[PDB]
Amino acid sequence: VHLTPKEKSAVTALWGKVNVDEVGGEALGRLLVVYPWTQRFFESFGDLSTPDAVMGNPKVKAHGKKVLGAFSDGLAHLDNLKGTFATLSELHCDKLHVDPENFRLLGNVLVCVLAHHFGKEFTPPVQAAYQKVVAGVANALAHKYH
Amino acid sequence: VHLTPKEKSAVTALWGKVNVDEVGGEALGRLLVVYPWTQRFFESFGDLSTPDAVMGNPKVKAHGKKVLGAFSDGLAHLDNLKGTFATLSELHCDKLHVDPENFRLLGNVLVCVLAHHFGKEFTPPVQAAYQKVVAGVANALAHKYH
Amino acid sequence: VLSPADKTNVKAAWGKVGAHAGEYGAEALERMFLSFPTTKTYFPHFDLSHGSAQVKGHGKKVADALTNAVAHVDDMPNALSALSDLHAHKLRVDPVNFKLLSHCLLVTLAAHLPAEFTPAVHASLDKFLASVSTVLTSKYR
Amino acid sequence: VLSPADKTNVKAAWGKVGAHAGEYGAEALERMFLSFPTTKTYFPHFDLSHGSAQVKGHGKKVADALTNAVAHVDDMPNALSALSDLHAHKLRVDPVNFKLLSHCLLVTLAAHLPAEFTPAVHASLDKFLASVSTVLTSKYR
Ligand code: HEM
Ligand code: HEM
Ligand code: HEM
Ligand code: HEM
């Protein structure tokens, strides 16, 4: 995906301020709460009975951290997302058979979490730049279906 | 997209029997009837007030013929759909701003029209091969969004 | 919303299916599993090969549920309430998958009932299956 | 379907929006036009630049419609019937676009109301906006 320099600047500047220990878990937790069918893929995580249970679940925070790392990795290779996400594409598509619509949903939940954390700093143009990024990541993760 | 030889065989064999003067118009007409918001892009075509008006509309049949030609062209280059559909991607995405979900819908309507015309000959495995094809075409037409 | 013409069209088209109801349901499932392999994961206790008695039996169940919806088209949320609970709560079926099965049911009908599958009836059937899908996905919580 | 807790959550969150209702609607539209440029084509008679009086005025209209839906949450098809006719028949708005605006409204609420945007309320608001979207797309014919 192609970001303008202004967009690259906006994205990289905000990402530097991201709490990398927490934001990933918050996005994954919210995915499980807002789109409950996704819980089908995480039965080994234990207590997902309430929103409070989900957000406080140690396995959700831990796994969310790995997700966020992958997004960070993507932000470093915006010009080669397909190669960056090849192994993860095989995992989510060939092994897990996650419908790719859910890649888009997680991306949009991440965008909501970034808005929540950054407030007025998450301007409409900054959002537009992040939408290009999460669309690119979702498309790359879905490549094994293509 | 990658078809097995058996799938390639199934697809090419059926396509040879397709009425190339009519099937395209039938698919485009059904798109306009079943998903009426798509009529927004064809106001210059005249009478679209009833299903009978749409299916009998000379401009719908004419334009449908061009669509089908593009699919035929794609069937000849399954290993390079992106290049094949580059100009059409710029048209539908950059100039027309058609949401790419509609590329998928037209593809699925085409699959319904093929089922209608070929009956029991349109077996579940033949359908599965054609679903790979129309997914590939839709993804290639949407490349300018990616 | 389903118009009067839609309900007439769906009732008439489904009337033509007849004793083939269960057979067509089984065929739609088969089409779905082959065309969209992600859907197979909901059925690990099923043998999904051609001629599987399990797919045949399940096709009949699907068809009977659709027939119930046709028979109670003005009261579908009530009629399908139990099935909505099952698919959303217990089974956690991804909502995208209902679009896939709906498409495979249309293809099945097109392949078997050429005279009935007019553009107008195609539109009505698509709206009907979308309405059924809306009810069956209404219970995620 | 919206649960009792969902309706409580949505009413409470929307209560906090207050006199900012129209402003937030305008901001959601702006977010949508910038993030998803295909949506701009519905508004050729609009100047969609930042600070546009037309986007501001339209944001107020959007917000007032959502407020009507909140106020009549158990009777939304009736309350929104006129707007459903407009968007589906006259304007021919692609159903995909309602998901895009819904997302931009959630982002707007998240950016302005951090205390209210809990995971539970996020879920309720998403369900509410999906319900509104279902009504506004119910009239294609
Ligand atoms: C942009 C979207 C996504 C990204 C970037 C992402 C990234 C990741 C990463 C980095 C891992 C860890 C892989 C490893 O341990 O080496 C993982 C595992 C996993 N993902 Fe995701 N993921 C995404 C979407 C999803 C969604 C939407 C689902 C389900 C609804 C899902 C289900 C899983 C599961 C079940 C695992 C565990 C696999 C295992 O441990 O065997 N992923 N993902
Ligand atoms: C797989 C999907 C599609 C294919 C293969 C396709 C193919 C084509 C082709 C070959 C043309 C003629 C271009 C030319 O004259 O050189 C065309 C034009 C056009 N297409 Fe499609 N199309 C697809 C989907 C759609 C959809 C879904 C819409 C709207 C809902 C759409 C709207 C249009 C319009 C408005 C034109 C006329 C453009 C003009 O004459 O300036 N297309 N398309
Ligand atoms: C028109 C849409 C659908 C209808 C009418 C329908 C109907 C039914 C019926 C009648 C049953 C059996 C209920 C019972 O025995 O108590 C059932 C079960 C089931 N459905 Fe569906 N269904 C639909 C869509 C789907 C989709 C899209 C999926 C997943 C891709 C799905 C997955 C399942 C599963 C996994 C079961 C349980 C099978 C078992 O454990 O034996 N359904 N459905
Ligand atoms: C939550 C979803 C939505 C709500 C509550 C909403 C509400 C409204 C309202 C209240 C009006 C003005 C009605 C009037 O003045 O008579 C309107 C008009 C309009 N809407 Fe929406 N709308 C929604 C989604 C959308 C979407 C997704 C699109 C397209 C991307 C769209 C495109 C339009 C257009 C083009 C107009 C007419 C503008 C004009 O000609 O001045 N709407 N909408």
Annotate D73-136 with DSSP letters as a single string.
GGGHHHHTHHHHHIIIIIS---THHHHHHHHHHHHHHHHH-TTT--HHHHHHHHHHHHHHHHHH
In the block, which residue shows the tokens 């058996």?
A: B6
How many angstroms is it from D43 CA to the middle of ligand 4?
10
Buried b (16+ CB within 10 A) or exposed e, A73-109: ebbeebeebeebbeebbeebbeeeebbbebbbbbbbb
Q: How many CB atoms lie under 10 A from the CB of residue A44?
A: 6
Query: Could you give the CA distance from residue A106 to residue A138 in angstroms, rounded to a whole number?
Result: 9
Query: Could you give the CA distance from residue A120 to residue B10 in angstroms, rounded to a whole number?
Result: 56
Query: Could you give the CA distance from residue C62 to residue C68 in angstroms, rounded to a whole number?
Result: 10
Q: How many CB atoms lie under 10 A from the CB of residue D50?
A: 11
Q: Are C137 and D131 in contact (CB under 8 A)?
A: no
As a residue count, chain B comes to 146
Q: Provide the CA B40 distance to its chain's centre, in angstroms.
A: 18
Tokens of B82: 């992106």
For residue C49, the SS3 value is coil
Q: Are A30 and A36 in contact (CB under 8 A)?
A: no
Cα–Cα distances in angstroms (integers) from residue C106 to residues A39, A120, B25, B38, B129, in the given order: 30, 47, 19, 20, 17
The angstrom resolution of this structure is 1.6
What domain range includes position C130? 1-141
Query: Could you give the CA distance from residue B83 to residue A7 in angstroms, rounded to a whole number?
Result: 28
In the block, which residue shows the tokens 């010009």?
A: A79
Instruction: Answer whether A27 contacts ligand 1 (Cβ < 6 A).
Output: no
User: Which residues, in sequence order, are CB contacts of B90 under 8 Å at separation 6+?
Assistant: B144
Measured CB to CB, residues of chain C less than 8 Å from chain A are: 37-38, 40-41, 88, 92-97, 140-141
Any CB–CB contact under 8 A between B144 and chain A? no
Tokens of C35: 């065309």
CATH superfamily of domain region B1-146: Globins (1.10.490.10)
Please tell me what DSSP assigns to residue B91.
Answer: I
Cα–Cα distances in angstroms (integers) from residue B98 to residues B38, C77, D32, in the given order: 9, 34, 16
Q: Domain of C139: which CATH number?
A: 1.10.490.10
Tokens of C28: 């739609």
Query: Could you give the CA distance from residue B27 to residue D101 in angstroms, rounded to a whole number?
Result: 30
Pocket-testing residue among C45, C60, C90, C91, ligand 3, by greatest number of atoms within 8 A of Cβ:
C91
